[model samples]
Target chain A: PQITLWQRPIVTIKIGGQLKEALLNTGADDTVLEEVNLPGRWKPKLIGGIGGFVKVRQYDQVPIEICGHKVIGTVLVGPTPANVIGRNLMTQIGCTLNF
Target chain B: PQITLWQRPIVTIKIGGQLKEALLNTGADDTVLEEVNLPGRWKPKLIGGIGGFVKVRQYDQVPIEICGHKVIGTVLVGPTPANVIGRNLMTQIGCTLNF
Candidate 1:
């Protein structure tokens, strides 16, 4: 039988060449890197959301280490609470959830 | 030598019992399900961000099959242009990025 579990994913990021831990939230649809935590150089481009166009910056495939594994892909930088890992990276790993 | 490719991940979602395809953007840090496309039953709870606490809904361990893999985890439902798969699900699958 398949049992269901309710837990969010967590990711470790290298911000300004510093390793910072963030939560991987499926709830967030836009790529967000908290302005409070981000380094000075990572300014983002403005884009629209349900609210309106938001400021976002694109990073060409950065090295990310998660769950003892590593993969490279482009990441968006923006202001958010901590860092949110989005679906783009999820499909690359072929993930499934238990609940 | 490792060549860098810039491509986002994609995930197939079942919305209102309908299968909708969405891109998995690592740029998107939050879990966002387009409200325009979501079913009426999936109302979200309000949470704060840089903008403020936005409305969100929590689904406990919904069954998600991606890349020939099936996993169950809690998914946050909200209004967005398309479903944004985030880090929460990525960590569950043990993913990494190459850039």
Candidate 2:
């Protein structure tokens, strides 16, 4: 499926049996989810964003689903304003930025 | 060319005699760049991002070139960590998110 930037690229994602909304952020390096009960060995990281800085728990190789597409990779959980789907997962879904 | 996100989408843009690199950000509503001199009417705006919010001088219908493509739209100038090419300008360049 192809989505234009005009649509804002907001999609539904499933992580740990919970459904959430995430923005497909081509600019982000890693996928970020809102605070959740995640299982895995994760390290604390302060990720930078436009507004400011937010602390996140970086868990590697986490299984998650975006719009029914399943993927396994680094998932950063934090108190972020919105869930973000970065290039890491976008690559898994075969998402592309076309001009 | 349809560049992948893996390339980081960091493309050189020429604005007002200055050549700067900018990130192609699909999640950003407006294009933001490092502070530079402008020759247009603009207003102050506070935009939100992954970390927090920042002050920006937003100019409307400003012309900028990315990858040799000319785009005229709202380009925000501010004290940013990096220059971000948001959806506002991406539209002018006919950028799309595909999967």
Candidate 3:
């Protein structure tokens, strides 16, 4: 799928058997999502962005299907303004920037 | 050109004849750059992201060249962590997300 930049590149994602919308954020280095319940062990971590930093729970090797492509990696749960699929997961899904 | 997500998709951009590197941020709605002096009339505005919001100077119809595509649009100048080419400029350059 080729998503045009005319709108926010938000796509449907399935995590922990639940569905949610997430932005395909190429600018971010790590994937961050809104607080969601997952069955696994997580550790406390900090992630920074445009404004400042936020402490979040990092769940490693978490499986998620993004826009139909399934991949497993570190998933951060925190108070993000929106769900963002960053570079870590994007690379696994073979997502790229093209013009 | 196709840029894989293995690394930050930073690209050279020409703004006011000055060369700078910027992240192609699909999650952002407006283009924000570090404190680069831009000529012309501008107004104050605020934009938010993962953490919070910051005040910026909005310059409309500003000319910029992303990669090699020349475009004119609104550009916000402020203290961003890195120079970012957002959806506003991406659309003009025909940038898209391909998987």
Candidate 4:
């Protein structure tokens, strides 16, 4: 039987007080950060999304460098799939995935 | 011209001590609950994933009734797209989407 291929990798950044490398994904629409590894006390906040508003904690914009590209945005501090670089950050850089 | 449409609803169950109504979605792979509406105090925990681990909080399983179906699962208390009923719940009930 053939297995259906789903999911892809996107660059992500771990921004605490500094920038870190990240694997971003288009499938995900939210920005995520590691709650345990975060640098400081960034309170989570609620943000509006296409489905509805999501509670996202605020953290210092951890600069993200991906595929030789970089951008800065408000980071959501939480537990994620190894710190996702979701649509929230991808939309800023105008990224497209090719298979 | 034709537009490529995407997205559908999946039944979600909110288990707190009781079940609540939810709109399940396949687009999302995780379970979510309202951080504010939760009935009890649930601390966040870190769960391992394909990429890494995600920090999630525990909350009372608010019973959820969707499309006249129901299930029991842990609710991830946080801000989400209107309380997502993701694949986590869908797989349990053997549900499929029709377009």
How many clashes (backbone N, Cα, C below 3 Å) per candidate?
61, 5, 0, 28
lDDT string, candidate 3, B3-41, tens digits: 998988889999978999898999877899999999979
Consecutive 10-residue window with the lowest summed lDDT within model 3 chain A: A46-55
TM-score of each: 0.45, 0.87, 0.91, 0.36
Q: Show where candidate 4 strays beyond 4 Å.
A: A1-7, A10-14, A17-23, A36-43, A46-56, A60-62, A97-99, B1-99
What overall lDDT goes with each candidate model? 0.52, 0.83, 0.89, 0.51
lDDT of predicted model 2: 0.83
TM-score for candidate 4, please give it: 0.36
In Å, candidate 1's interface RMSD is: 11.1
The order of the candidates by TM-score, greatest first, is 3, 2, 1, 4
Error of 1 at A97 (Å): 18
True contacts kept of each: 0.00, 0.78, 0.96, 0.00
Q: Which structure among the candidates has the greatest DockQ?
A: 3
Question: Which TM-score values does chain B get in all models?
Answer: 0.63, 0.89, 0.92, 0.53
lDDT of 2 by residue, A28-65 (tens): 88888888988768799888743467787999888888
TM-score of 2: 0.87
Poorest stretch of ten by lDDT in candidate 1 chain A: A1-10
Pairwise lDDT winner, candidates 1 and 2: 2
lDDT preference between candidates 3 and 4, better one:
3
| Error of model 4, residue B35, in angstroms | 29
Question: Which 10-residue span in candidate 4 chain B carries the lowest summed lDDT?
Answer: B1-10
Evaluate candidate 3 by giving its C-alpha RMSD to the native, one decimal: 2.1
Instruction: Give the clashing residue pairs of candidate 2, or none.
Output: A49-B51, A51-B52, A51-B53, A52-B51, A52-B52
lDDT of 2 by residue, B1-99 (tens): 787777588889998878988888898878878879899588998886424677789788887888889777778887877888888888888888887
> Where is model 4 chain A poorest over a 10-residue stretch in terms of lDDT?
A1-10
